[PDB]
PDB file of C-alpha atoms and ligand atoms in Angstrom:
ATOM      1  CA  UNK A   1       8.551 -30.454  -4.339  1.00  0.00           C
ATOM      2  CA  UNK A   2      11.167 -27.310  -4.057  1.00  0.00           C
ATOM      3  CA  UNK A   3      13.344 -26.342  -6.685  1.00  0.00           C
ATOM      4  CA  UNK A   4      14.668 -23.117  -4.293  1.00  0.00           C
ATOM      5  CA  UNK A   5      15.850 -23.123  -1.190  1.00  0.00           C
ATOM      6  CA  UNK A   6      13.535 -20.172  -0.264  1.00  0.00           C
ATOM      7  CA  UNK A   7      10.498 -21.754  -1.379  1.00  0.00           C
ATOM      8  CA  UNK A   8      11.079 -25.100   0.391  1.00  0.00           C
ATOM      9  CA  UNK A   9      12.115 -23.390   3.447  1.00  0.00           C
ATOM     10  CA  UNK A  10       8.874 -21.444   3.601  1.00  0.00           C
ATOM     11  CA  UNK A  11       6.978 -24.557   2.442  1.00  0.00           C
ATOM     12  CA  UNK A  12       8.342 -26.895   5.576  1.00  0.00           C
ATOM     13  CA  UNK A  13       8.211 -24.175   8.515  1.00  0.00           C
ATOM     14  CA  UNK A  14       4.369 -24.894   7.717  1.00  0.00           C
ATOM     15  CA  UNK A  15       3.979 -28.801   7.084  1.00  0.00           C
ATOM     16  CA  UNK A  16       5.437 -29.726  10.483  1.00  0.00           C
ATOM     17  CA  UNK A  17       3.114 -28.251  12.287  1.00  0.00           C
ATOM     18  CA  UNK A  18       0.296 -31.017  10.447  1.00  0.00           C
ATOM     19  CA  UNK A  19       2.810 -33.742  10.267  1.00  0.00           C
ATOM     20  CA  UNK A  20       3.571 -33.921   6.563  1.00  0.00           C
ATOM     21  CA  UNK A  21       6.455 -36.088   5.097  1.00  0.00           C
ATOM     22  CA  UNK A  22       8.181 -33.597   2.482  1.00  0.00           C
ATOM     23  CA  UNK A  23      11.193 -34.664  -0.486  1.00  0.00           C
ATOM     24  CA  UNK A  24      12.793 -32.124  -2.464  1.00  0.00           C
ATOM     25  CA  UNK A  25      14.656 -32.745  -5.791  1.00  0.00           C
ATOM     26  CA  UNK A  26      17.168 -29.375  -6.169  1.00  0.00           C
ATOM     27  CA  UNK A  27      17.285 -27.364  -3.278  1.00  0.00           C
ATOM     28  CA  UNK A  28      20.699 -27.851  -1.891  1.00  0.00           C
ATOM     29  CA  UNK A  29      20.570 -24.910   1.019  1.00  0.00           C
ATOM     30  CA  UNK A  30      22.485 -25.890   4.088  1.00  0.00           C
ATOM     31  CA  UNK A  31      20.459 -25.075   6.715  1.00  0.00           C
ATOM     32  CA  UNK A  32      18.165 -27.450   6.461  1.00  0.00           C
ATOM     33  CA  UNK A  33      19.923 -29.886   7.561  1.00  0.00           C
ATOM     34  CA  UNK A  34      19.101 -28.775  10.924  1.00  0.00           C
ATOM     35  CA  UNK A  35      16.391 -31.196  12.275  1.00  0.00           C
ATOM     36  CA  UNK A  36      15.463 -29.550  15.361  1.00  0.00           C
ATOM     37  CA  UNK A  37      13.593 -27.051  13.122  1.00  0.00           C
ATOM     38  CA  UNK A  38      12.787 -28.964   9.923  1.00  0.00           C
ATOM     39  CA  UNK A  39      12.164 -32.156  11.503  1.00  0.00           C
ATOM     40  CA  UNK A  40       9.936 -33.819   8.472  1.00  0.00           C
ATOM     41  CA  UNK A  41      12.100 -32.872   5.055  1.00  0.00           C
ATOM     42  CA  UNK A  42      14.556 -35.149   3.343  1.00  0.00           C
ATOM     43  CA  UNK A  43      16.453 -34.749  -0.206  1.00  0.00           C
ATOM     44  CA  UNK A  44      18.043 -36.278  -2.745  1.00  0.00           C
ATOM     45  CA  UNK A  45      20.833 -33.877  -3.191  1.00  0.00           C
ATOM     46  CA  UNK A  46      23.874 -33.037  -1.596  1.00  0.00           C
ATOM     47  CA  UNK A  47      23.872 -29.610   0.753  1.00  0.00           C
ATOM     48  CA  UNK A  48      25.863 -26.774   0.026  1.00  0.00           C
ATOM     49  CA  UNK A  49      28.890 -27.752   2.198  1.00  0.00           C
ATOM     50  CA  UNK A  50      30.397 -29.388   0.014  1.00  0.00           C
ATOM     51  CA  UNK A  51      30.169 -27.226  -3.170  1.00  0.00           C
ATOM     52  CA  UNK A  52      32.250 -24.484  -1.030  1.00  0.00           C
ATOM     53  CA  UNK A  53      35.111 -26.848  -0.932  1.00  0.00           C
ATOM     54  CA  UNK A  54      35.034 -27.653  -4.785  1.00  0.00           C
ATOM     55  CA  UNK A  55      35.188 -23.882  -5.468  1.00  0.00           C
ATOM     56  CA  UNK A  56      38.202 -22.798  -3.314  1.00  0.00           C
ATOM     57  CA  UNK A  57      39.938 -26.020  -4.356  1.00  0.00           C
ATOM     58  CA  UNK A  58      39.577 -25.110  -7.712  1.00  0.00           C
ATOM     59  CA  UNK A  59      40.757 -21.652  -7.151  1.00  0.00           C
ATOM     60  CA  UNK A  60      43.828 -22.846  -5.256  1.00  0.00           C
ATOM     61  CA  UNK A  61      44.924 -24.816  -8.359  1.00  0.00           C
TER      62      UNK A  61
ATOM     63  CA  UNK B   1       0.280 -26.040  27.695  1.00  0.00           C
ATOM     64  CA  UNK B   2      -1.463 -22.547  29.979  1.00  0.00           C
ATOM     65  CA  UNK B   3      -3.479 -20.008  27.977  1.00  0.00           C
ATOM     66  CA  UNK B   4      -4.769 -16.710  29.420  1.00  0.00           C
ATOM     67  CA  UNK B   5      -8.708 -16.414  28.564  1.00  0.00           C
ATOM     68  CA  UNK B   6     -11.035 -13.357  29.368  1.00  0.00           C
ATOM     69  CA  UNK B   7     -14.562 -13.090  27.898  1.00  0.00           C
ATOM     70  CA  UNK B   8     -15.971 -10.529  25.595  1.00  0.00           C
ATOM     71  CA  UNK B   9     -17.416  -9.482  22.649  1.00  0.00           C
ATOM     72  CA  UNK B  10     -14.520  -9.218  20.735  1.00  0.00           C
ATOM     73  CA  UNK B  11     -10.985 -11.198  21.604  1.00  0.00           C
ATOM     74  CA  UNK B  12      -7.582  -9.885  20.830  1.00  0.00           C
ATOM     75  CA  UNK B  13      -4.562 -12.215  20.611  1.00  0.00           C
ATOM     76  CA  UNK B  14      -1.431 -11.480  22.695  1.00  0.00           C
ATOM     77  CA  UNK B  15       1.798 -13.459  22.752  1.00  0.00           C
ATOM     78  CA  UNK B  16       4.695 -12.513  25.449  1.00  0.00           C
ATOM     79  CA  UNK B  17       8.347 -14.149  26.097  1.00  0.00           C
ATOM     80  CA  UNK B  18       7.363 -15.475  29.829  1.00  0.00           C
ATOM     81  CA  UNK B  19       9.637 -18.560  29.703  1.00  0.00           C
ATOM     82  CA  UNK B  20      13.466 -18.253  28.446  1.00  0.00           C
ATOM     83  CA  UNK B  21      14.498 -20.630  26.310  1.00  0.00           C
ATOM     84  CA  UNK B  22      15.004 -24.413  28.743  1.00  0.00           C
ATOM     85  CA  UNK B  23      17.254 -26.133  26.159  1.00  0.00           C
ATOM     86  CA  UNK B  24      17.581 -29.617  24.485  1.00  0.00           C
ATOM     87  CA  UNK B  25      15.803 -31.377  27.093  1.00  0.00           C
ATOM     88  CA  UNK B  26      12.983 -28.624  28.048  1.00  0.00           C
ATOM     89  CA  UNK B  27      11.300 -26.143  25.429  1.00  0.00           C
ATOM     90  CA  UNK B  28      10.233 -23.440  28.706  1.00  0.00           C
ATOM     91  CA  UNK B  29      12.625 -22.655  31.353  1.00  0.00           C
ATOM     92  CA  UNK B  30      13.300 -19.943  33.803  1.00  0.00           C
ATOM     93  CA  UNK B  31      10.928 -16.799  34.001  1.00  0.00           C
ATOM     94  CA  UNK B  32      11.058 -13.362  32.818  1.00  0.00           C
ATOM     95  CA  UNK B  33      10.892 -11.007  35.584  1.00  0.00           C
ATOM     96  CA  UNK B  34      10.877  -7.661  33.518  1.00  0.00           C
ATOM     97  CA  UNK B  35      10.249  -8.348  30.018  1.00  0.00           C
ATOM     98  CA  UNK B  36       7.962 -11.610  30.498  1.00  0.00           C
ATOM     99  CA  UNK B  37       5.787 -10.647  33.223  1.00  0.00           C
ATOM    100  CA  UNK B  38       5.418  -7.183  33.746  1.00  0.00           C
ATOM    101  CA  UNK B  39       4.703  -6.507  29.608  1.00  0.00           C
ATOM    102  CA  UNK B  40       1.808  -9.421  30.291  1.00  0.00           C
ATOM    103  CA  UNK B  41       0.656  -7.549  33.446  1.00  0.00           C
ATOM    104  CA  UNK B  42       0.814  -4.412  31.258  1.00  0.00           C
ATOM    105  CA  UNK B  43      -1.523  -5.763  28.512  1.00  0.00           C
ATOM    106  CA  UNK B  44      -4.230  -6.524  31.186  1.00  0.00           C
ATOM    107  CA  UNK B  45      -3.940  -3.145  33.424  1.00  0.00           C
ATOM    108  CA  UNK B  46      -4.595  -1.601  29.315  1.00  0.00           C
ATOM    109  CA  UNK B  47      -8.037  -3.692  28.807  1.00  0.00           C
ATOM    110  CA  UNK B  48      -8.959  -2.898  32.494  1.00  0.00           C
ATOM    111  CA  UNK B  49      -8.789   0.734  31.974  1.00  0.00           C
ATOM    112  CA  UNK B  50     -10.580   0.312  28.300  1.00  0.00           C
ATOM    113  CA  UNK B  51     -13.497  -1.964  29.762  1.00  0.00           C
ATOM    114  CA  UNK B  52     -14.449   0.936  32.186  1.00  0.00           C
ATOM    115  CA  UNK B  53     -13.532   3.714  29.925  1.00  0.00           C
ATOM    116  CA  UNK B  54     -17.103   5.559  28.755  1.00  0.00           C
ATOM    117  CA  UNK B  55     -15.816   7.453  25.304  1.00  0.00           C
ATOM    118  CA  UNK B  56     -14.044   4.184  24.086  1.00  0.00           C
ATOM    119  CA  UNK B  57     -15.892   1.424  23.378  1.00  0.00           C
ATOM    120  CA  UNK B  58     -18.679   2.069  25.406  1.00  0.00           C
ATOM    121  CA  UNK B  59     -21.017  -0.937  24.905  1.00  0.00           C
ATOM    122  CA  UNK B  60     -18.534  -3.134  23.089  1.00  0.00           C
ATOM    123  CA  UNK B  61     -16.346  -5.712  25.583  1.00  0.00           C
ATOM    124  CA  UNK B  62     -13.110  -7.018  24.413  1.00  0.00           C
ATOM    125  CA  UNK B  63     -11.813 -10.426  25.128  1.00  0.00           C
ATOM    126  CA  UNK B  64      -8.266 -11.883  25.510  1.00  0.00           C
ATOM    127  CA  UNK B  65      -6.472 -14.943  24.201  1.00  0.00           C
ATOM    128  CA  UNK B  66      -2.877 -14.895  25.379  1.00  0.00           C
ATOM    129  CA  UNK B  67      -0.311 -17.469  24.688  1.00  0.00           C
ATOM    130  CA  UNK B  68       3.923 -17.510  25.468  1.00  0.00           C
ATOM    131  CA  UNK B  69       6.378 -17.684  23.229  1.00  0.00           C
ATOM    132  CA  UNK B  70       9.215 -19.233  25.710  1.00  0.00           C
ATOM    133  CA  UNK B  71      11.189 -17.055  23.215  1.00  0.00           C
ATOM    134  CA  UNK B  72      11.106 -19.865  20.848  1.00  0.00           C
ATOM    135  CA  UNK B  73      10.245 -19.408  16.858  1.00  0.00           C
ATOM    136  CA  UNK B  74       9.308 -23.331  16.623  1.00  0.00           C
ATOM    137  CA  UNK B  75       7.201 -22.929  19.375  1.00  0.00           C
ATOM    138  CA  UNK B  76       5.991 -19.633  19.069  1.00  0.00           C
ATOM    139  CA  UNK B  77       4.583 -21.085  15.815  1.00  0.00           C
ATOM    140  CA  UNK B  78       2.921 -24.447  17.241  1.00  0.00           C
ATOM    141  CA  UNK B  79       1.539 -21.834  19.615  1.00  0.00           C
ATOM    142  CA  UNK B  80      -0.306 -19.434  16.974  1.00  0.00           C
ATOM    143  CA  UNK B  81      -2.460 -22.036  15.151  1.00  0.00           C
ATOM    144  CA  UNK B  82      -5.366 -21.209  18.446  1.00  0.00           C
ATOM    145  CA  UNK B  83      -5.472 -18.079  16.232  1.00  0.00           C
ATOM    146  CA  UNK B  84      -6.284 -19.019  13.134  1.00  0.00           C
ATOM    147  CA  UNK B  85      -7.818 -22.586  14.061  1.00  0.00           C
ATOM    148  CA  UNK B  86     -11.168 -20.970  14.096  1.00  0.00           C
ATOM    149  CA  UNK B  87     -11.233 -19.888  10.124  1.00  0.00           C
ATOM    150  CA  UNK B  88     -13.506 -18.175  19.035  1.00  0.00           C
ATOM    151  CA  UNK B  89     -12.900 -15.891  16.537  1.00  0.00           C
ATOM    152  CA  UNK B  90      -9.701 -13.698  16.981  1.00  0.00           C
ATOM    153  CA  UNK B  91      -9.712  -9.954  15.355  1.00  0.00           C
ATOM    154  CA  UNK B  92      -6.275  -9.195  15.844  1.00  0.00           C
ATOM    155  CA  UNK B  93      -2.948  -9.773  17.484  1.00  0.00           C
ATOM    156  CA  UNK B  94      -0.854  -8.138  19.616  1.00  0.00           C
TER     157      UNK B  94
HETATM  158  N1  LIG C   1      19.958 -25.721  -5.862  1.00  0.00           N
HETATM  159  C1  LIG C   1      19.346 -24.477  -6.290  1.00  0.00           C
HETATM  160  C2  LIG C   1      18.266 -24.733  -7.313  1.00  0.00           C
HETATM  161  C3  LIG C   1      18.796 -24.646  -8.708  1.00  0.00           C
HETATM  162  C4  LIG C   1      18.157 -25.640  -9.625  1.00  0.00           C
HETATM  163  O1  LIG C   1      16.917 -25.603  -9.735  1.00  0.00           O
HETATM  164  O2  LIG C   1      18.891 -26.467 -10.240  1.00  0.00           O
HETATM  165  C5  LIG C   1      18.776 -23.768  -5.064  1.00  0.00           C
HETATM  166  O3  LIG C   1      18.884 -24.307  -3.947  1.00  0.00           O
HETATM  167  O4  LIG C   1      18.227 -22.670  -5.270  1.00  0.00           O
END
């Protein structure tokens, strides 16, 4: 579960502390992608860093 | 892993930055000369002067459970589940 960021940010601050696996399906936030903090959460999308370069390249053409 | 306990009737919570952030390898370093020890020392010279106090809470003894922070959120949060583990009981948090 997670569709936003927000929501699976909130939702994984609280299942590490009871050792929960958690896989999200749309939220593409960067920061967590930090693992010292959310050190159980995985996803099947790509973060944001990369959407940032799409943008300005397409603005540059 | 240390946790400050008093006895009484009711317990209030504390939680104080005594450690500075260690780093990778440690979670606690270093200690907090003004803001981690003399707050901590504050919070119990308070309760003394309560627990003899006649007009406030005269028959009513309050507790203490305080925990440190090591000015960490991650473990500032592993740290706060003694408060709400029970639901001793702990009325509120300072
Ligand atoms: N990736 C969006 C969710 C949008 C969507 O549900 O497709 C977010 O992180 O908020």
């Amino acid at each position: 579960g997670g569709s936003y960021s927000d929501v699976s940010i909130q939702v994984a601050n609280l299942l590490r502390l009871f050792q929960i696996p958690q896989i999200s399906y749309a939220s593409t936030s960067a920061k967590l992608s930090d693992k010292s903090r959310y050190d159980y959460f995985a996803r099947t999308v790509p973060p944001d860093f990369f959407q940032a370069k799409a943008m300005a390249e397409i603005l540059r053409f | 892993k240390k946790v400050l306990t008093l006895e009484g009737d009711l317990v209030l919570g504390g939680l104080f930055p005594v450690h500075q952030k260690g780093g990778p390898a440690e979670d606690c370093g270093p200690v907090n000369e003004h803001r981690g020890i003399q707050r901590l020392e504050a919070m119990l010279f308070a309760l003394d002067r309560i627990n003899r106090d006649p007009h406030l809470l005269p028959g009513v003894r309050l507790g203490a459970h305080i925990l440190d922070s090591c000015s960490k959120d991650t473990h500032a949060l592993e740290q706060a589940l003694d408060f709400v583990r029970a639901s001793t009981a702990i009325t509120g948090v300072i």
